[PDB]
Amino acid sequence: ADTIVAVELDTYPNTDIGDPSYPHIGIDIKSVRSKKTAKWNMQNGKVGTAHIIYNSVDKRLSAVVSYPNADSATVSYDVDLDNVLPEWVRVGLSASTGLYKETNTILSWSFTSKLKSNSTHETNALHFMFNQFSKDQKDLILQGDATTGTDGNLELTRVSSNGSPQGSSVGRALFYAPVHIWESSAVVASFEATFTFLIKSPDSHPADGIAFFISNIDSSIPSGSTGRLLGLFPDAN
């Protein structure tokens, strides 16, 4: 299967597959069953901001999610990503709905990776930033129901013209260029990702969430990965 590392913004508690009994943030290493979670006080209809950081020295993947005027939620997990991921990856956003639903709207997305070697003055680096998505976004790969360009946003999951989210939807967006997270002469490797998002539901119980992920470069939406599997995983193992 694909190899997946993800930070999940999980809006629906599937306690049968180990979710806590509340909306939560989590760190997913090759399984939808988060290695670590923290409670997340999601705010229906408000614009949130997620931040993800990691470096190869501390080997700690951390995330922070916040809304204006509110405390933030944070979660961290010790993992060496060079032991999980291949040396070339793609980075992306994914989201899903099931029998419960929500908008999975991305308003902005930025990423920076750096490989610093022991050569004097020798950094390799990639940075992108989207504050405005367009209809024909050639530096993104859209998969499943993902679309760009309406209100300059990336709608990861399906929404009607009148703007109501649809259930049983799944969509991802990957940056077009492969990213290099390891090289043999690297003395420090780091990445960071930020995204702003607007999850809205007509319903008291929204589902299913949004994830930032890192994958093998050929990664595709697994079969049956609507709902609780967040467009990331083929099953709940």
Ligand SMILES: O=C[C@@H](O)[C@@H](O)[C@@H](O)CO
């Ligand atoms: O070797 C590293 C460089 O290619 C970097 O720019 C990549 O991580 C980004 O495409």
Ligand SMILES: [Ca+2]
């Ligand atoms: Ca869930």
Ligand SMILES: [Mn+2]
């Ligand atoms: Mn979860």
